[PDB]
Amino acid sequence: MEMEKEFEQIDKSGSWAAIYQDIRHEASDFPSRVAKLPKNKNRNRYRDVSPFDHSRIKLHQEDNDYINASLIKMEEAQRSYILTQGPLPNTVGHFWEMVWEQKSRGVVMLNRVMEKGSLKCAQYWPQKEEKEMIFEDTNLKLTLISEDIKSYYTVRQLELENLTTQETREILHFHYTTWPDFGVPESPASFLNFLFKVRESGSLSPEHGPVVVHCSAGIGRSGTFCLADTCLLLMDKRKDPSSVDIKKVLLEMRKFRMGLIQTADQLRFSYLAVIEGAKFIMGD
Ligand SMILES: Cc1cccc(Nc2ncnc3c2cnn3C)c1
Ligand SMILES: Cc1cccc(Nc2ncnc3c2cnn3C)c1
């Protein structure tokens, strides 16, 4: 079926939970043996969210190459993404090592450091220009260059220096600051505006390594971001945009990381975002 009318048919019939459970039943199951080794227990935030072995990102290190991060490679859309958990106190150096080694231009953050009164990820970037951060375990230096605070999101320019080679690179930090502690946003308008700002920066384009995107576990809000982006790109590329099937795209992405889209409310929000986004692209 088309998307917008499949949407109203699920609303009127109140069957979002059944649709979402079907997706969960059909989703791929691949091994995640490296994630479960005892030496990696303090590298995982949640015991039930792990990268598959076949798609995990490997650190260029001979001691321990593990990070909780996955490469989502979308062949028809010609887009790749790295989805990862929010960094932990003992993995902030690994996080920036990955950014460096994978040649990423941008980092997309969809959570606040504290939500619901608890810490959802480490404070992994500097908050003042004159107070830079050094990660001694991976030999990197990170400096805040500039910050632009807007009503729904903040963009930061960061400098990452490999202290071994003295090479430097500019990284863009796109921080969506207004996702509610509970539920999903009422309108997709600010989330779509944010997605378009990431696109306009070059961070999603083939001349760079894959964008790094995270929330707390790296599957819920993060899944919504890449699902909406890929569906909108396919609607631009194909002769028949109504042929784009969001459930099929989501199942393809779940071949590469488990659990993407965590609730039936997040599934409905993803439909809403793609539907509204397709009107703004055109040709409008
Ligand atoms: C606040 C912020 C966030 C992200 C990127 C940038 N970059 C720039 N922002 C404004 N003017 C700029 C540049 C680079 N060159 N020039 C001339 C700034
Ligand atoms: C926030 C951000 C990140 C990355 C790229 C950009 N690009 C620009 N955004 C706005 N005006 C711009 C440019 C480049 N030239 N000029 C004149 C902005």
Side-chain angles (χ1 to χ4, degrees):
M1 196 185 315
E2 174 189 58
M3 190 170 30
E4 172 145 36
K5 291 185 283 154
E6 190 199 349
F7 179 86
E8 321 231 55
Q9 198 241 322
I10 302 169
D11 259 7
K12 74 170 170 50
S13 54
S15 47
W16 282 109
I19 302 300
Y20 177 66
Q21 260 304 140
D22 298 350
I23 288 164
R24 291 189 60 159
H25 180 71
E26 287 297 326
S28 302
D29 189 24
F30 292 114
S32 312
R33 286 168 208 132
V34 180
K36 302 309 279 171
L37 297 173
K39 67 175 174 162
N40 291 324
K41 196 157 181 179
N42 77 340
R43 291 181 183 216
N44 296 309
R45 184 177 286 285
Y46 303 104
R47 56 153 177 71
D48 58 334
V49 180
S50 302
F52 300 141
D53 294 325
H54 78 87
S55 55
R56 75 185 182 95
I57 300 294
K58 299 179 186 184
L59 306 171
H60 300 177
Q61 225 260 91
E62 41 190 16
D63 169 52
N64 189 341
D65 71 11
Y66 178 75
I67 180 169
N68 191 317
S70 309
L71 179 65
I72 298 21
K73 189 171 186 195
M74 300 306 287
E75 186 171 27
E76 184 190 356
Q78 285 293 291
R79 278 270 223 259
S80 295
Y81 318 83
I82 292 166
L83 268 64
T84 189
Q85 69 185 13
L88 291 155
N90 62 296
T91 70
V92 172
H94 307 150
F95 178 89
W96 287 113
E97 176 185 4
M98 176 174 67
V99 169
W100 182 269
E101 287 167 356
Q102 303 299 317
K103 303 180 156 55
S104 309
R105 180 84 189 292
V107 173
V108 173
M109 171 170 183
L110 304 170
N111 65 289
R112 292 168 300 282
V113 165
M114 179 165 285
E115 300 184 4
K116 295 180 184 182
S118 301
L119 293 173
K120 299 296 169 193
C121 91
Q123 181 61 55
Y124 65 87
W125 73 95
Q127 295 176 281
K128 295 180 181 303
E129 287 87 342
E130 68 278 10
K131 295 277 205 191
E132 75 273 14
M133 290 178 81
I134 294 173
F135 304 101
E136 296 185 341
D137 59 337
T138 56
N139 215 33
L140 292 159
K141 177 176 105 172
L142 182 66
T143 307
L144 177 67
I145 299 301
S146 75
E147 178 168 71
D148 191 357
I149 302 173
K150 305 276 224 301
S151 47
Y152 290 91
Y153 69 99
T154 297
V155 188
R156 309 181 177 92
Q157 298 183 310
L158 307 172
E159 183 203 64
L160 188 60
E161 183 179 346
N162 179 348
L163 292 173
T164 300
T165 67
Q166 292 193 328
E167 308 169 283
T168 66
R169 279 175 213 161
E170 181 186 322
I171 310 298
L172 302 182
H173 194 239
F174 287 91
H175 189 183
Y176 188 80
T177 53
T178 50
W179 196 294
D181 270 10
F182 290 94
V184 305
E186 184 159 297
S187 161
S190 56
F191 191 69
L192 286 164
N193 188 60
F194 174 77
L195 167 61
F196 298 156
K197 297 294 186 186
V198 179
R199 278 183 175 197
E200 290 176 2
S201 78
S203 291
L204 290 164
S205 300
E207 63 250 26
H208 301 293
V211 69
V212 172
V213 353
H214 78 88
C215 45
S216 192
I219 61 175
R221 299 172 198 177
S222 292
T224 302
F225 184 88
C226 60
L227 181 60
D229 183 52
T230 283
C231 284
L232 291 168
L233 211 50
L234 293 170
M235 288 177 79
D236 269 348
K237 215 171 201 255
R238 285 185 186 176
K239 290 185 180 184
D240 177 11
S242 76
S243 71
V244 172
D245 184 333
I246 178 167
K247 302 188 259 49
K248 286 176 177 168
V249 178
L250 179 53
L251 288 165
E252 179 66 26
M253 292 184 162
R254 278 193 180 216
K255 299 178 179 171
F256 300 91
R257 186 169 177 83
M258 60 171 68
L260 303 181
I261 309 298
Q262 283 179 291
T263 68
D265 259 35
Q266 280 176 6
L267 186 64
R268 180 181 187 274
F269 180 76
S270 300
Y271 273 74
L272 266 184
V274 174
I275 292 168
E276 186 60 25
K279 309 167 153 158
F280 199 74
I281 207 118
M282 316 183 171
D284 193 344

